[PDB]
Design a protein around this ligand. Structure first.
Ligand SMILES: *[B@]([O])(O[C][C][C][O])[C]([C][C][C][C][N+])[N]C(=O)[C]([N]C(=O)[C]([C])[N]C(=O)OC([C])([C])[C])[C]([C])[C]
Ligand SMILES: [Ca+2]
Length: 223
């Protein structure tokens, strides 16, 4: 997260770290056995690390659970990043409490100007790399579809939205992928792509989760 603030340990209890010997992507727990992340985070040998704050120190409250199957959306297109979403099923259910809790799926899409929280362990620097140890947080508004499309002409599908700041300086960045965008207590976005990090007129683009709620529900119910 570039331009953000330290969240405070376990203040974002639905955030997960997907790990394969290092943190590579964020994720959201949406019930005791299922995590939602981004399809471009897919790989095998994924360990879901729940209840984390410093990802480099075991501090208490951590639950490390192997991913039993990852389910990339069938229409995921890796050249457009359209339908960038994947569900990870956990090998055993997590124990839920105040430091590890699931976030709700939206019942409607959020309007332009809704203030949301984006969080993750990715790069904090726009020019160069600085990985944080602890979870970083950013409050950022959803941008109107016109300013999003004026920034990325031709690249925005209806499954995507921009959030952030046109003046630059604050944004998600590399290592934040797969992580949550929560607006009024509902998971509305998944961190996906952008042109670099926190550059002027280039906001982050996020998978629009309200379009996928029946898919999530139906895929979880059949698996
Ligand atoms: B994401 O993948 O983090 C995990 C990467 C390391 O394991 C990251 C989120 C970036 C959000 C920026 N607001 N997403 C990506 O890196 C995706 N690629 C891009 O955003 C790239 C750098 N830019 C891009 O595709 O657009 C142009 C610059 C216009 C070419 C990618 C990995 C899906
Ligand atoms: Ca830790």
């Amino acid at each position: 997260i570039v331009g953000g603030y330290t969240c405070g340990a376990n203040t974002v209890p639905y955030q997960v770290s997907l790990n394969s010997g290092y943190h590579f992507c964020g994720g959201s727990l949406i019930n005791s056995q299922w995590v939602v992340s981004a399809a471009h985070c897919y790989k095998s040998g994924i360990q879901v690390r729940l209840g984390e704050d410093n990802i480099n120190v075991v501090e208490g409250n951590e639950q490390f659970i192997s991913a039993s199957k990852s389910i990339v959306h069938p229409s995921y297109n890796s050249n457009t990043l359209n339908n960038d979403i994947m569900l990870i099923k956990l090998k055993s259910a997590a124990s839920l409490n105040s430091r590890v809790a699931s976030i709700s799926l939206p019942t409607s899409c959020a309007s332009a100007g809704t203030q949301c929280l984006i969080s993750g362990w990715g790069n904090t620097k726009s020019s160069g790399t600085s990985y944080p140890d602890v979870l970083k947080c950013l409050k950022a508004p959803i941008l109107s579809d016109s300013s999003c499309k004026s920034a990325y002409p031709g690249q925005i599908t209806s499954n995507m939205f921009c959030a952030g700041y046109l003046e630059g300086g604050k944004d998600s960045c590399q290592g934040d992928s797969g992580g949550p965008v929560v607006c009024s207590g509902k998971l509305q976005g998944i961190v996906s792509w952008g042109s670099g990090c926190a550059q002027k007129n280039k906001p982050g683009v996020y998978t629009k989760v309200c379009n996928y709620v029946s898919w999530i529900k139906q895929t979880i119910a059949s698996n």
